[PDB]
């Protein structure tokens, strides 16, 4: 009963989540790579003492 559509939807979902995981990992490695300079106005963090 689920051979079509019901199974294709699951296949696309699994492949899309895997693609999202790899996309996140590549974004992370790229963010680590481009560590030249970070000068931005709208961001701040506390620094006690």
């Amino acid at each position: 009963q689920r051979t079509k559509n019901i199974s294709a939807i699951s296949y696309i979902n699994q492949r899309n989540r895997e693609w999202n995981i790899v996309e996140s990992e590549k974004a992370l490695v790229a963010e680590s790579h481009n560590m030249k300079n970070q000068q931005m106005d709208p961001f701040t963090r506390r620094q006690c003492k």
Binding site: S24, E25, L28, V29, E31, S32
Partner: protein
């Protein structure tokens, strides 16, 4: 090996594992199971003859 600056992604895998192992309402189920597992037996046993 420590995980420097690749940690936003690794931060949410642990969250996903937690929410997979234990549900959102896990405390209710655990409390009720412990009741049905020990509390009833305790109450019926400690009652004097």
């Amino acid at each position: 090996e420590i995980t420097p600056d690749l940690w936003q992604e690794a931060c949410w895998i642990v969250i996903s594992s937690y929410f997979d192992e234990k549900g959102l309402v896990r405390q209710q189920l655990d409390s009720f199971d412990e009741f049905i597992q020990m509390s009833v037996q305790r109450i019926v046993e400690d009652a004097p003859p």
